Amino acid sequence: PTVKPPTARKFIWTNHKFNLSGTPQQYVPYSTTRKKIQEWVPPSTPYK
Amino acid sequence: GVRTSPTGEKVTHTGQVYDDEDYRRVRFVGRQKEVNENFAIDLIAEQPVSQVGSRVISCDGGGGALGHPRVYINLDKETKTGTCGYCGLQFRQQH
Amino acid sequence: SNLIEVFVDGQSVMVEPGTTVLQACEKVGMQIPRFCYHERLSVAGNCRMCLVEIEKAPKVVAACAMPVMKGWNILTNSEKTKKAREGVMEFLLANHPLDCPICDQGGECDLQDQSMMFGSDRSRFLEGKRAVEDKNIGPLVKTIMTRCIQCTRCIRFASEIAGVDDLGTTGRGNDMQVGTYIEKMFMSELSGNIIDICPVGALTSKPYAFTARPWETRKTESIDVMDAVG
Amino acid sequence: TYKYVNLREPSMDMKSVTDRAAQTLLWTELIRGLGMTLSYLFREPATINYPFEKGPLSPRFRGEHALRRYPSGEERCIACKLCEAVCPAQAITIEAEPRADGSRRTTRYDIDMTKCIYCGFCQEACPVDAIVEGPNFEFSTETHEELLYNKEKLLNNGDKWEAEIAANIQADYLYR
Amino acid sequence: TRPTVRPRNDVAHKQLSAFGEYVAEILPKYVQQVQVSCFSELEICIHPDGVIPVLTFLRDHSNAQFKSLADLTAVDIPTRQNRFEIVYNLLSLRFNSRIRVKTYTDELTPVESSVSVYKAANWYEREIWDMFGVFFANHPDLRRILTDYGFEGHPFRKDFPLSGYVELRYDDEVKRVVAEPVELAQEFRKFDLNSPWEAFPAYRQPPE
Amino acid sequence: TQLITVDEKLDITTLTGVPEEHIKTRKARIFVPARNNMQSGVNNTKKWKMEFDTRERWENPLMGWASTADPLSNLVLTFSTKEDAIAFAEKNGWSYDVEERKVPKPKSKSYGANFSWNKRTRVSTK
Amino acid sequence: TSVKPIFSRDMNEAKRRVRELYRAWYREVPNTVHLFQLDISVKQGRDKVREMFKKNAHVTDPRVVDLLVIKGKMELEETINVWKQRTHVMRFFHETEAPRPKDFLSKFYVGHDP
Numbered sequence A: 001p002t003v004k005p006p007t008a009r010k011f012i013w014t015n016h017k018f019n020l021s022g023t024p025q026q027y028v029p030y031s032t033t034r035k036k037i038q039e040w041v042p043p044s045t046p047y048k
Numbered sequence B: 001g002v003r004t005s006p007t008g009e010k011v012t013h014t015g016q017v018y019d020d021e022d023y024r025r026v027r028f029v030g031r032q033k034e035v036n037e038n039f040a041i042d043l044i045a046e047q048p049v050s051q052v053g054s055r056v057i058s059c060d061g062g063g064g065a066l067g068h069p070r071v072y073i074n075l076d077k078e079t080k081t082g083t084c085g086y087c088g089l090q091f092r093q094q095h
Numbered sequence C: 001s002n003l004i005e006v007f008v009d010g011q012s013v014m015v016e017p018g019t020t021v022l023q024a025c026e027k028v029g030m031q032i033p034r035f036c037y038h039e040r041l042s043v044a045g046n047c048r049m050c051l052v053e054i055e056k057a058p059k060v061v062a063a064c065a066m067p068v069m070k071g072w073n074i075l076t077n078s079e080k081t082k083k084a085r086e087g088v089m090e091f092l093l094a095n096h097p098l099d100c101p102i103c104d105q106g107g108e109c110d111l112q113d114q115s116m117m118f119g120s121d122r123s124r125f126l127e128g129k130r131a132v133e134d135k136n137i138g139p140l141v142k143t144i145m146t147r148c149i150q151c152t153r154c155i156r157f158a159s160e161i162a163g164v165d166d167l168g169t170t171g172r173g174n175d176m177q178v179g180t181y182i183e184k185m186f187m188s189e190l191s192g193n194i195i196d197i198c199p200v201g202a203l204t205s206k207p208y209a210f211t212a213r214p215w216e217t218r219k220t221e222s223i224d225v226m227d228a229v230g
Numbered sequence D: 001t002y003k004y005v006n007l008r009e010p011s012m013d014m015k016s017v018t019d020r021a022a023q024t025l026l027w028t029e030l031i032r033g034l035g036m037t038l039s040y041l042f043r044e045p046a047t048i049n050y051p052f053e054k055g056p057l058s059p060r061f062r063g064e065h066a067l068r069r070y071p072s073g074e075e076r077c078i079a080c081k082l083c084e085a086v087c088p089a090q091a092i093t094i095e096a097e098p099r100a101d102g103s104r105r106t107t108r109y110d111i112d113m114t115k116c117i118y119c120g121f122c123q124e125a126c127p128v129d130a131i132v133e134g135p136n137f138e139f140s141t142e143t144h145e146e147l148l149y150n151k152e153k154l155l156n157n158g159d160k161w162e163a164e165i166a167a168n169i170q171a172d173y174l175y176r
Numbered sequence E: 001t002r003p004t005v006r007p008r009n010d011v012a013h014k015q016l017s018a019f020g021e022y023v024a025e026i027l028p029k030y031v032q033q034v035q036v037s038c039f040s041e042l043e044i045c046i047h048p049d050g051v052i053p054v055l056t057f058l059r060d061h062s063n064a065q066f067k068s069l070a071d072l073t074a075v076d077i078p079t080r081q082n083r084f085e086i087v088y089n090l091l092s093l094r095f096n097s098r099i100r101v102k103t104y105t106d107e108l109t110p111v112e113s114s115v116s117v118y119k120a121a122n123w124y125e126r127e128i129w130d131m132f133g134v135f136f137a138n139h140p141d142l143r144r145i146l147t148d149y150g151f152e153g154h155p156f157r158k159d160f161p162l163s164g165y166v167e168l169r170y171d172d173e174v175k176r177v178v179a180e181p182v183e184l185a186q187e188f189r190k191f192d193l194n195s196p197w198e199a200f201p202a203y204r205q206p207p208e
Numbered sequence F: 001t002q003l004i005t006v007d008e009k010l011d012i013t014t015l016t017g018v019p020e021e022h023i024k025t026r027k028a029r030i031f032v033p034a035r036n037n038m039q040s041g042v043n044n045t046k047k048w049k050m051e052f053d054t055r056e057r058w059e060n061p062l063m064g065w066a067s068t069a070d071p072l073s074n075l076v077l078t079f080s081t082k083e084d085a086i087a088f089a090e091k092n093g094w095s096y097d098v099e100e101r102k103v104p105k106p107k108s109k110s111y112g113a114n115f116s117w118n119k120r121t122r123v124s125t126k
Numbered sequence G: 001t002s003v004k005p006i007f008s009r010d011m012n013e014a015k016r017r018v019r020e021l022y023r024a025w026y027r028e029v030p031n032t033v034h035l036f037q038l039d040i041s042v043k044q045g046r047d048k049v050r051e052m053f054k055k056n057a058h059v060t061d062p063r064v065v066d067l068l069v070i071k072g073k074m075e076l077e078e079t080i081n082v083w084k085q086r087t088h089v090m091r092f093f094h095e096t097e098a099p100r101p102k103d104f105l106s107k108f109y110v111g112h113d114p
């Protein structure tokens, strides 16, 4: 790769952080979705 | 190019962040909530809207058989830009 | 007693006089493929898919709107019937864009199903592929008129059930825009019904537009509410 | 046409039977087996020094599950669900929403790396070639949570490199 | 037609037709159907009484050897009063031909234990007893093969769902592995893929 | 050998092995699957599908999924007639509901009456 | 409407075979609790044996009773040998609650099961 190193793409990291398991810095999964059913809010305004 | 939640962590490109009365925040404790910090909404606006000097034009996306198939889009909107659904980038016309 | 014999593939069956060839084939079980016929509207003949080789005639005739003469013999699986269907299917798929990933009828198309079960396996027509600029019909119905195959079914539905008369053909040649001329927000009752009339992915639901694809869902019995008819 | 083994007889010539009896009494072909094994002793061993010399591979290895994106552009996927339909393990799970740009997009795109059998059907089924079987095969995961990838893990896995995946696809876009 | 399509050999078609007509006309007591496929492999459709005489006749008689026995599967079909299908498969060593002996059977009435005439059907009968429930009458040893011991339910039926009714897990309270009712981790989406529009016109059954 | 046989009902729910709650609580539905209206094709008709009622499908909070404790939820049995459908559902034990079949009623459509003279039937566009 | 029966003609031989099978299971239990080294007294095991016999006590088709005789005899063979280990014999019991009651009220606080 001293013959053709690069690519013409402006998003590649400048770190290349390696296999990072068994650290305080690794991956956890979660839900990449917004609110499902949107529960109701009671009115703060009272009566009686 | 990211926002930051009022809880103090990074939101995603989708507004999916948590409230104060959750527990998946506490399963995020100790290990980093990863987020791709290079979004996709703002990368469209940095592109030059090409002004092609014809009427009805073509789009492939940088490479034959490497990208999305041929879509031929129309440019008859005299003030609006024709948008490829695949590419996501705009066009104009100049006779 | 007022019955005419048709020999569908040699099998004789009695048909009420005056009705179409296609209802006789649906009586015996056959489905001649169709794009501009529907079992609720008037019978136009603009899609050319309904063809059939009726014997002792050198010319293939339609079966969407053919009256039944006495004692037919109907060949639905002959040679030039299949050649006519492959030809017409190859004609339809020319000026129709590559949108089957992003089109909102991936599981519920009609060009896809009938192009598999009757069409060719290779294409032609290297150049061309015109494009029609879309409209903004309403906030209820998303509209891309490029996928419109000009089949004249939303027009007949509007003018004969909706009674609104806000849809029309415009132009000649390839350039026949089906739509509304005056940039008017087409708003009426039963305008939600037009997104199931349109057999291709040209008139889809606006709020639903990109949330599923119809093989993942499962279908479930239910009853209409907030209306007295159900 | 056939060629069957073991049809002879032990000979009745005294020389042949005393050669077989010499093999019996004198451990001869056992020593010839020792000679063959010493002849493979004096070869040079074909071991690769693993963490410094990694093993040979193909241009079309099926690895890492990294997404791609457009040249100087946005995300390549569509949420058209073809990969989820073809996925035989049914490990793909997609929830789509469109965004403010008008073009259709996603919300959730999960691969169960536990369930993924690493076929290539999602590589060959994507009409825009968004999901690609990645180059490298180094996962080695402690917990069981970390083998459940989100869209952001896949995009960071595809933005830690694309030039590798771009080199592989530009090498072999002609076969598939 | 001439490329891209596997041709058929009408010589073997006529030969298997004449042979099946011969077998059907010389065993009238138990024969209902002798059907020939397009690809010329014979199927003989049989009442569940003459299993032992038809197999003894088809092991011998020197007009058809068929010493070789293969599989037996009773593929489960609802909307039949007699549901299951025993499919013997017979191969001749001298002749290079294959005949599928399909006898039908119900849920409870046994077929007559082909292990007495073909020694290769022992584990076949035991296995299909475990997986279906087709009993075999006067068989030496009937146990469970290809299931767990404490499991029951005959899982290759259509009434048994894809996920089983049990789910094992270890626990430390009772220090062992126990079974709980099933708790999936994902739904197993059974998609709708039956598309309309009649891809095969030659197989249109006559309706009511 | 033509033995004593009685001609009665069947009780196969003891032998199918599935426990009592999934036997007697869930109720089958025998229906002809209706035509998916965005297409127009009745090849997907002509069968009697047996399905079960759906039950709870919560959210697995680690991935945003749909788990369920329902083994019988994902069955469908394709049948040829309603008679053998009811015979099977009463053979195997569980309670059931049977609907009937609905067909397109034969109309009498004609292009020549679509171009009429003194009737109000007139296409007004073609 | 001719059906070949399995073993029995009427319910007499069915009752005879099933009480024979119960006699065998009665004299088979203490050998199992001595062999597999279980953790349960003889009384509780015999009570759940007679419970499992009393569960299906209302089936009158003799073919079905014969087929359950065959099922119980297969399990008796595979428990009188040392094939089925400790896990399956404990799996016959239900000590891993599942305490899910059959009220209406407690079925209402943990709902969706009428």
Ligand code: SF4
Binding pocket: C096, C097, C098, C099, C100, C103, C104, C105, C106, C109, C110, C111, C112, C147, C199, C200, C201, C202
């Ligand atoms: S209507 Fe949609 S799915 Fe059908 S052929 Fe056109 S683009 Fe493809």
Ligand code: SF4
Binding pocket: C147, C148, C149, C150, C151, C152, C153, C154, C155, C178, C197, C198, C199, C200, C202, C203
């Ligand atoms: S919009 Fe749809 S229904 Fe109307 S003519 Fe076009 S294809 Fe036909």
Ligand code: SF4
Binding pocket: D076, D077, D078, D079, D080, D081, D082, D083, D084, D094, D125, D126, D127, D128, D129, D130, D131
């Ligand atoms: S097949 Fe490709 S474009 Fe379609 S959902 Fe999968 S990754 Fe996205």
Ligand code: SF4
Binding pocket: D083, D086, D087, D088, D089, D090, D091, D092, D111, D115, D116, D117, D118, D119, D120, D121, D122, D123
């Ligand atoms: S490689 Fe196979 S199992 Fe893995 S995600 Fe792709 S299609 Fe699914």
Ligand code: FES
Binding pocket: C034, C035, C036, C037, C044, C045, C046, C047, C048, C049, C050, C051, C062, C063, C064, C065
């Ligand atoms: S149905 Fe369209 S032409 Fe007859």
Ligand SMILES: [Zn+2]
Binding pocket: B059, B060, B061, B068, B071, B084, B085, B086, B087, B088
């Ligand atoms: Zn494009």
